[PDB]
């Protein structure tokens, strides 16, 4: 969805305050002292004693009686009236409370709970994100300045977080007015009474020589007004900018995220304080002024003396050793739509090495639209990034366009292990969010020698080791998706690892909107996918939409196994159905992912073939799994079939399936169609040209004198290859199972030559070729 | 301005504490500001009694009874009414009591806030300077002490600062005051019993095993009466005096700033305690004596076992790289008026490399007068400190003097890149001030004379790189200006750093005054200029006896503290005229400096020429401008014109215009007037001998065969230098546009010896030399 930034969050908390600030208390002195469990018991005493006292008082008021007897009875009347009066006073306090106050207070509290929950959904993400950041940071070589802020802040932070947690949860677990805690029977007045008493005790403890001291000093330490003025913000900046912290997002991303965490903490605490006050008696204190002032102070700090020092450069978070190829010329294009813009990348490998690219339209001041977003998946990216036992040329540049431009299309080129690329940017307007389509800039070469002389040099090379090259792995994006104006590759072959890097507009993307208190619209980096062919794959709304269950044991049930999320539940016959055939293009790969608990029965069936089925694994706690498959020759009828099992209990949701864009290649001289078989030989889909025994393939191929040619191919099954010009062997090599790498030098093929793809000559032989590549140098 | 020391601040605090100790009413002379508790109790009793009396009275009104059975009821009614009159007397007494108590309290708090602000203004400056240490105190290697001490001290410090800020909210109640000062006619009884409950709470949090405790233990640690001694002050010194703090002032100045901060904090906290206890009823215990006790204890500690360990040495704060020169022999004289003495230096670079020095009279015990101070600006000092393209010699020579002596004139001399300097001090009486003019000392470069004839030894040399050397930059003084007895230069050509350093009387300048609580008239080190040809150069307030507001809207924008500090204001016609043509001297460079916001029209003219203008750069908030300009050929009529750039609103202040002392040179044998124009050649302003096309300048010069000579000159225009005897060419070199460095050995002279400054045969490019320097070695 959206994250409306710290200013919008503060406005939300201020509106919650303005709501609770007004409603009512009637004074009503909610002191816990009231026994509050004898509203029944005292009533009996009150009634009986009232009757007795009335009878006796009327007997006296009859008059006409022995004088001293009258005095005696009058004294008895006085005593009884005193006892009864204090008793009914206690009862009247209790009952006045349990009729006037608890309904009012319960209503206001129930109201404050929901909006609190809503605002907590605005930072749920960054919570876990800062948890992860804390996991991967090391404080070696810290200065005394660090220990300074640590001891200056840690108790206040401890207690502020603790109180926010405790109160916020107690807002929920307090019975609401349905019971009204009334005298109804009992044990409602044990448990709901215990919880109400605990709420009372907590809120009471918030008015003393503490917790308006803790809040204030916390704010001060943040702003950096302590005994020698070292804002914890700055020391956190220093700690984060220290390396070994290579995770998603750049410096600015991480520090701003930190400040989001802390500011949300402070605002939550202010809300809690005001709620406590109103929950007690009187003297409401409009804290909104102080809260806004403190938030603006911390933001001014962050803006002035930290932000201009940080980098928007962001790298892949991890690496991975992988075996790629050399006989191929893979070319990859990531071209956003004409009205779109690149907004980050991601590399996954678990189904297969896959680069993913997001794209979207732009809103002013470098803000992204939630919709119009799109994820695109690409194929064997390792084959572009990884060799197989041969060196790799990597041209490395810090390509960056001028300000106002946005990287709009990144095309990759690997030509005979020379890895360059193409970065093209368009013009964009921050004031209107509009991206121009008629003012572009291009970058064809990827070094500094071409940067200063337009001459080809200054790449870097990697000598292919055995196990595999450390290729990029993980997410390539800022913590908040953002159009980038800088990009580059910075491989360090010293240890055989590659690294991508870009420069983000995040700085200016926020400096115009948030730190100036305007409507901010960011988007947290999507941890997983965002779209799917399965419509409403994210079943949560208790509605199936295109989903369909043909059995009442298959139901939607937002609280399938828990109210936290829905996961289509099926037991012993439960089947969730969805026609999906119309969207899967034939002969195309697809990756599948879903979070499943139990052992469900999953099917991709067109009533004739089940393109995929998994019915084996049993998952206690919603294990997600990912598999792949290629669409059949005609999947136009395939359904989605979430069945339960033969019989079992099943859970499952977020059934994501996406097209894996097949990897393409550069042109060559060879053509998979110009081949000439010679009996007992059959070519395959990938121009494989398998020798089915005794026979061969050939294809006439024209050469020139002053041109160099690189012949590359691999075979499945032993065989041979021969380039005979007309009688002379321009080449003749025996190959068993390996990648041919011969490079024919300057030689004018007389007339025409051809490659006699002759494998071995026995009956049971199968010499299958892979990549008939005669790429000319 | 002025600053009256820790003792003066304690005097102010004690004065105000006495003031509040003597102002109140009684009433609570028998109560404890439970005036309210008894007041409400009495009110309830009056209400119930009145309700009873009403029923008795109307039952009487029914009448129709026996006389005695009525007359007895009549007597009972009389008794009840008299009882009600009695309680009404009591309650009216209480009403009048609190009705006097409250408004006096309000007025007292008003006065407390005013005077507290007036005092805190006198530490506000030196509070900020503590951050100039904060940024550069990244100190390590003994951090265990500054972990222990901080972990032990910082809670009490936080709490004290918090309590203090409760008096900004006191100021908020001061703001409230005018809303209820007028309706004090028995309406306050619940109006102004609210509207201050914040304070009524804060004060209650000043008892009971609490804040008093924190103040006490804080004092105890600062003095160092802890478990193991080690006052936080000692470790604070051990931190601040170490590891490249490299900011103005010495160990003494900085540690003293620290102690000023701490003692000022404590004094303000004691004032707050007593102000609270004067409110909230009364007990009237003057903490005066205890406060003076604690302050004197901390001062005794600081004097005894910290002050001796400190040094009065101090470096310049910053360096700057600037291409200097070797063709010039710059001589600089820094001499005070006879009744004055130098108190510190300052190097500015922004409008130009410029050296500033302050000189002033003396108050006894090494103190300085406010209005006797004066600033002086000298020219391009890089020409004195930095070479160009050659080496340069520097007489590192740590001059000193006996006590009672004070530096009075420092003369700088760069001769053939030999940099030495003569320092001339005078004698002075610590008592009565009275520098005497007849007991002087001169130690120029001959501190080696006592043991070695080579007075010219004990120096160093730097080789000029292509871009210049790190010349000193910033302020040369102690945190408080002070006549210095020590001075020297300690260049480090290992990193091309030139360093100025001296010794300050600070130790003595205070050891007799502040640790003895006497007068302590100090001056904090300024941060910019303090004098200007512009009178009231900032603004006084509402009064611009220097300025002439020709328009009406050309008023003072804030005119009183509302837009922060003073700023002239102009909009749509606005202008402030001020005739200054009498204070400018023709053909003299003058520095311009001022702070502005928005779009102003900067004008310096005599209605006949714009000597300077700025009509652009609409700044966000009060940006300062600093540029340069030369006085025209006749500035007698010029005056200032701060107008508005355009229809917009403008702001501006701190208009500074100062004369720059042009640089001076040692004498040399070549004379400009002795030049012989021989054919279409004329002299220039800078003595440049413009060779108009063809021709040459010549001038007879008697060289001697005993000494070595040095001719140097830079030219504009292709030319030839020609030193010929009557027969022989002693020198004949040609020059295009560059400098010239020639060393002639024993010059065999034949009487007719001269140099002919000849260009080349280019009629357009007039050959223009710069420095006719035949300086004799």
B147:A147 CB<8 A? yes
- Residue B204 contacts residue B277 (beta carbons within 8 Å): no
Cα A425 from Cα A442, distance rounded (Å): 7
Query: Helix axis angle, B145-176 relative to B251-278, nearest 10°?
Result: 40
Q: Encoding tokens for residue A338?
A: 């004409």
Query: Helix axis angle, A144-172 relative to A213-223, nearest 10°?
Result: 140
SS3 readout for B66-88 = CHHHHHHHHHHHHHHHHHHHHHH
Cα B494 from Cα B500, distance rounded (Å): 16
Cα B730 from Cα B751, distance rounded (Å): 13
- Residue A440 contacts residue A338 (beta carbons within 8 Å): no
Cα A558 from Cα A551, distance rounded (Å): 17
Q: Count the Cβ atoms, other than its own, within 10 Å of residue B412.
A: 19
B197:A283 CB<8 A? yes
Cβ-nearest to B162 among A151, A216, A227: A216
Most A CBs within 10 A among B131, B136, B162, hence the mutation to make, goes to B162
Q: Encoding tokens for residue A702?
A: 């024209």
User: B165-203 in b/e burial notation, b at 16+ Cβ within 10 A?
Assistant: ebbeebbebbeebeebeeebeeebbeebeebbebbbebb
- Residue B509 contacts residue B519 (beta carbons within 8 Å): no
A228:B138 CB<8 A? no
- DSSP class per residue in A36-77: -S-TTHHHHHHHHHHHHHHHHHHHHHT--S-HHHHHHHHHHH
Question: Across-strand partners of B625?
Answer: B594
Cβ-nearest to A213 among B143, B154, B159: B159
CA atoms within 13 A on the CB side of B73: 17
The shortest C-alpha distance from B171 to chain A (Å) reads: 15
Q: What is the DSSP letter of A519?
A: -
**Consecutive H or E run containing A570:** strand A570-571
Locate tokens 């023709």: which residue? B586
Cβ-nearest to B150 among A151, A213, A283: A151
Q: Considering all CA atoms of chain A, what is the largest pairwise distance in Å, rounded to the nearest integer? A: 155
Q: Encoding tokens for residue A327?
A: 């006989």
Nearest Cα to Cα of residue B614 among B634, B574, B589, B644: B644
Cα A768 from Cα A696, distance rounded (Å): 11
Question: Across-strand partners of A664?
Answer: A331
Q: Calculate ∠ Cα B382-B388-B393, nearest 5°.
A: 80
Q: Which residues of B touch A210 (CB under 8 A)?
A: none
The shortest C-alpha distance from A417 to chain B (Å) reads: 45
Give the method used. cryo-EM
Cα A716 from Cα A731, distance rounded (Å): 20
**Consecutive H or E run containing A164:** helix A144-172
Cα A360 from Cα A376, distance rounded (Å): 12
- Residue B56 contacts residue B77 (beta carbons within 8 Å): yes
The shortest C-alpha distance from A320 to chain B (Å) reads: 39
Nearest Cα to Cα of residue A328 among A741, A743, A755: A741
Cα B648 from Cα A626, distance rounded (Å): 65
Helix (H/G/I), strand (E/B), else coil: A374: strand
Q: Encoding tokens for residue B154?
A: 């910082």
CA–centroid distance for A253 within its chain: 14
Q: Which residues of A touch B201 (CB under 8 A)?
A: 207
Cα A161 from Cα A164, distance rounded (Å): 5
Most B CBs within 10 A among A144, A226, A306, hence the mutation to make, goes to A144
Cα B155 from Cα B468, distance rounded (Å): 50
Q: Encoding tokens for residue B327?
A: 């063709």
Residue B552 sits at φ, ψ, to 5 deg, of -85, -55
Cα B604 from Cα B637, distance rounded (Å): 10
Cα A463 from Cα B550, distance rounded (Å): 80
Nearest Cα to Cα of residue B156 among B248, B244, B232: B232
Nearest Cα to Cα of residue A580 among A616, A607, A552: A607
Query: Helix axis angle, B232-240 relative to B288-305, nearest 10°?
Result: 50
| Secondary structure E strands in B239-329 | 313-314, 318-322
Cα A171 from Cα A199, distance rounded (Å): 8
**Measuring CA to CA, how many Å separate A749 from each of A700, B392, B748?**
11, 74, 86
- Per the document, the length of chain A is 777
- Residue B293 contacts residue B270 (beta carbons within 8 Å): no
Nearest Cα to Cα of residue A506 among A406, A374, A361: A406
- Residue A657 contacts residue A377 (beta carbons within 8 Å): no
Q: What is the DSSP letter of B603?
A: E
Nearest Cα to Cα of residue A252 among A315, A343, A317, A314: A314
Cα A30 from Cα A16, distance rounded (Å): 22
A220:B161 CB<8 A? yes
Question: Across-strand partners of B650?
Answer: B570, B598
CA–centroid distance for B333 within its chain: 25
Chain A: residue whose CA lies nearest to B165: A216
Cα A175 from Cα B527, distance rounded (Å): 64
- Residues of A near B (Cβ–Cβ under 8 Å) read 143-145, 147-148, 151-152, 207-209, 213, 216-217, 220, 226-230, 283, 285
Give 3-state DSSP helix, strand, coil % of chain A, rounded to 5: 30, 30, 40
Query: Helix axis angle, A232-241 relative to A144-172, nearest 10°?
Result: 110
Q: Encoding tokens for residue B332?
A: 């600089």
CA atoms within 13 A on the CB side of B736: 0
Q: Which positions ≥6 away from A507 have C-beta within 8 Å? A: A252, A307, A310, A312
The shortest C-alpha distance from A158 to chain B (Å) reads: 15
| Secondary structure E strands in B632-718 | 639-644, 649-659, 664-665, 676-678, 690-691, 696-700, 709-712, 715-716
Nearest Cα to Cα of residue B650 among B612, B618, B604: B618
Q: Encoding tokens for residue A449?
A: 């020698």
Cβ-nearest to A208 among B143, B146, B205: B205
Helix (H/G/I), strand (E/B), else coil: A516: coil
- DSSP class per residue in B22-53: T---SSTTSSSSTHHHHHHHHHHHHHHHHHHH
A228:B134 CB<8 A? yes
Nearest Cα to Cα of residue A473 among A624, A626, A247, A243: A247
Nearest Cα to Cα of residue B410 among B298, B511, B332: B332
* DSSP β-ladder status, A690-691 and A681-682: antiparallel
Q: What is the DSSP letter of B591?
A: E
The shortest C-alpha distance from B157 to chain A (Å) reads: 8
Cβ-nearest to B139 among A144, A151, A217: A144
Locate tokens 């100790």: which residue? B21
Cα B375 from Cα B354, distance rounded (Å): 12
Nearest Cα to Cα of residue B499 among B455, B448, B444, B462: B462
Cα A249 from Cα A254, distance rounded (Å): 7
Helix (H/G/I), strand (E/B), else coil: B586: coil
Q: Calculate ∠ Cα B108-B110-B111, nearest 5°.
A: 65
SS3 readout for B497-534 = ECCEEEEECHHHHHHCCCCCCCCCCECECCCCCCCCCC
Q: Encoding tokens for residue B246?
A: 């490299």
**Consecutive H or E run containing A295:** helix A288-305
Q: What is the dihedral of CA A374, A378, A382, A388, to 10 degrees?
A: -160
Q: Encoding tokens for residue A712?
A: 């590359």
Cβ-nearest to A229 among B134, B139, B143: B134
Helix (H/G/I), strand (E/B), else coil: A521: coil
Cα B776 from Cα B749, distance rounded (Å): 15
Q: Encoding tokens for residue B223?
A: 């003095």
Q: In chain B, what is the straight-line distance between the N-terminal and C-terminal CA atoms, in Å?
A: 49
Q: Encoding tokens for residue A466?
A: 């055995």
User: B596-629 in b/e burial notation, b at 16+ Cβ within 10 A?
Assistant: bbbbbbbbbbbeeeebbebeeeebeebeebeeeb
Ramachandran bin of B663, using left for φ above 0, alpha for ψ from -120 to 50, beta for the remaining angles: beta
Q: Encoding tokens for residue B535?
A: 């009178």
Q: What is the DSSP letter of A98?
A: I
- Residue B712 contacts residue B741 (beta carbons within 8 Å): yes
Nearest Cα to Cα of residue B458 among B469, B450, B447: B447
Cα A695 from Cα A760, distance rounded (Å): 8
Cα B744 from Cα B729, distance rounded (Å): 12
Cα A378 from Cα A662, distance rounded (Å): 7
- With the C-alpha atoms ordered A138, A144, A146, A148, is the resulting torsion angle positive or negative? positive
Nearest Cα to Cα of residue A446 among A487, A479, A477, A474: A487
Q: Considering all CA atoms of chain B, what is the largest pairwise distance in Å, rounded to the nearest integer? A: 159
- Per the document, the length of chain B is 777
Question: Across-strand partners of B487?
Answer: B399, B502
Q: What is the DSSP letter of A97?
A: I
- Residue A642 contacts residue A615 (beta carbons within 8 Å): no
Name the resolution in angstroms.
Answer: 3.9
Q: What is the DSSP letter of A101?
A: I
SS3 readout for B135-204 = CCCCCCCCCCHHHHHHHHHHHHHHHHHHHHHHHHHHHHHHHHHHHCCCCCCCCCCCCCCCCCHHHHHHHH
């Amino acid at each position: 969805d959206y994250f409306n930034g710290i200013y919008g969050f503060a406005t939300g908390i201020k509106d919650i305050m303005g709501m609770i600030f007004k409603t009512d208390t009637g004074g009503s002195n909610l002191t816990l002292d009231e026994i509050l469990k004898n509203q029944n018991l005292l009533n009996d005493i009150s009634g009986k004693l009232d009757g007795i006292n009335g009878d006796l008082g009327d007997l006296i008021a009859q008059g006409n009686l022995n004088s001293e007897l009258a005095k005696e009875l009058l004294k008895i009347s006085n005593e009884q009236n005193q006892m009864l009066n204090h008793v009914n006073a206690q009862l009247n306090a209790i009952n006045s409370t349990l009729n006037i106050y608890l309904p009012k207070i319960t209503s206001m509290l129930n109201e404050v709970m929901k909006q609190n929950h809503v605002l907590s959904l605005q930072i749920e993400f960054l919570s876990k994100q800062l948890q992860e950041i804390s996991d991967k940071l090391d404080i070696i070589n810290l200065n005394v300045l660090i220990n300074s802020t640590l001891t200056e802040i840690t108790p206040a932070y401890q207690r502020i977080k603790y109180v926010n947690e405790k109160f916020d949860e107690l807002t929920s677990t307090v019975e609401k007015n349905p019971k009204s805690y009334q005298d109804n029977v009992t044990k409602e007045v044990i448990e709901n009474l215990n919880e109400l008493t605990e709420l009372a005790k907590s809120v009471t403890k918030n008015d003393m020589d503490s917790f308006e001291f803790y809040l204030q000093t916390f704010h001060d330490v943040m702003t950096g007004n302590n005994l020698f003025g070292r804002s914890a913000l700055k020391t956190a900046s220093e700690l984060i900018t220290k390396e070994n912290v290579t995770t998603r997002g750049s410096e600015i991303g991480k520090v701003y995220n930190f400040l989001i965490v802390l500011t949300s903490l402070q605002a939550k605490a202010f809300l809690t304080l005001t709620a406590c006050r109103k929950l007690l008696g009187l003297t409401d204190i409009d804290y909104t002024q102080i809260m806004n002032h403190h938030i603006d102070g911390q933001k001014r700090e962050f803006r002035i003396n930290i932000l201009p020092t940080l980098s928007n450069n962001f790298s892949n978070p991890s690496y991975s050793k992988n075996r790629g190829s050399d006989i191929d010329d893979p070319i990859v294009v990531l071209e956003a739509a004409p009205g779109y813009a690149l907004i980050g990348f991601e590399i996954l490998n678990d189904p297969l090495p896959i680069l993913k690219g997001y794209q979207a339209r732009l809103k002013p001041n470098y803000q992204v639209d939630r919709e119009s977003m799109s994820e695109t998946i690409y194929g064997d990216i390792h084959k572009l990034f990884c060799p197989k036992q041969l060196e790799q040329k990597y041209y490395i540049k810090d390509i960056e366009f001028p300000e106002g431009y946005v990287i709009t299309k990144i095309v990759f080129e690997k030509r005979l292990n020379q890895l360059g690329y193409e970065v093209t940017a368009n013009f964009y307007d921050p004031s209107t969010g509009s991206i121009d389509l008629n003012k572009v800039k291009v970058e064809s070469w990827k070094e500094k020698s071409c940067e200063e002389d337009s001459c080809e040099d200054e790449y870097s090379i990697i000598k292919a080791e055995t196990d595999g090259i450390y290729m990029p792995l993980g997410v390539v994006s800022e913590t908040f998706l953002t159009p980038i104006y800088g990009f580059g590759l910075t491989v360090d072959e010293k240890n055989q690892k590659i690294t991508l890097t870009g420069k983000s507009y995040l700085r200016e993307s926020l400096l115009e909107t948030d730190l100036l208190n305007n409507e901010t619209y960011l988007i947290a980096s999507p941890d997983g996918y965002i779209s799917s062919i399965v419509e409403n794959w994210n079943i949560t709304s208790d509605n199936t939409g295109s989903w369909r269950a043909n059995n009442n044991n298959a139901f939607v049930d937002k609280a399938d196994t828990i109210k936290g999320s829905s996961s289509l539940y099926t037991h012993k016959d439960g089947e969730f159905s969805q026609f999906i055939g119309n969207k899967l293009k034939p002969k195309t790969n697809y990756v599948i992912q879903y979070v499943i608990k139990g052992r469900p029965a999953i099917y991709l069936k067109n009533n004739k073939d089940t393109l995929f089925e998994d019915t084996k694994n049993n998952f206690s706690d919603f294990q997600t799994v990912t598999k792949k498959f290629n669409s059949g020759v005609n999947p136009s009828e395939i359904y989605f079939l979430f069945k339960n099992q033969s019989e079992y209990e099943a859970w499952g949701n977020n059934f994501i399936i996406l097209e894996i864009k097949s990897l393409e290649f550069l042109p060559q001289m060879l053509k998979p169609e110009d081949w000439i078989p010679s009996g007992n030989v059959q070519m395959k889909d990938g121009g494989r040209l398998e020798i089915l025994g005794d026979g061969y393939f050939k294809q006439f191929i024209k050469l020139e004198n002053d041109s160099t040619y690189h012949l590359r191919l691999s075979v499945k099954g032993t065989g041979r290859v021969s380039i005979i010009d007309e009688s002379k062997y321009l080449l003749f090599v025996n190959v068993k199972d390996e990648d041919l790498t011969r490079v024919i030098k300057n030689t004018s093929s007389k007339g025409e030559c051809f490659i006699a793809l002759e494998g071995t000559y026995v009956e049971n032989s199968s010499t299958i070729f892979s990549n008939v590549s005669i790429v000319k140098e």
